[PDB]
Amino acid sequence: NLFNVARGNLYLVQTATNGNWSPMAPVAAPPFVRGGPNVRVVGRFGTI
């Protein structure tokens, strides 16, 4: 971080709050980790 280089991953969820939103230091467990119940990955190509 002291060099502008966050680790971990990046979540994209539409949380529309009003309180102290905190992108960096996230309170609580991250919603849906990899390999969680019904959490499919994207096949290499990513085709739709």
Partner 1 sequence: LRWPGLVDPNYRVGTNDLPNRITLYNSLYRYNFTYPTLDGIMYVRSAT
Partner 2 sequence: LCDALTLHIRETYIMLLRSMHQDPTQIVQIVNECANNLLNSTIPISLRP
Which of 1, 15, 37, 45 contacts partner 1 by CB under 8 A? 45
Binding flag, residue 9, partner 1 (CB under 8 A): no
Contact region with partner 1 (CB under 8 A), list: 3-11, 12-20, 29-37, 38-46? 38-46
Task: List alpha helices for 1-48, DSSP H.
Answer: none
Whole-angstrom Cα distance, residue 20 to residue 38? 30
Task: State which amino acid sits at residue 1.
Answer: N
Site for partner 2 in 26-45 (CB under 8 A): 45
Whole-angstrom Cα distance, residue 28 to residue 38? 21
Q: Which residues bind partner 1 (CB under 8 A)?
A: 44-47
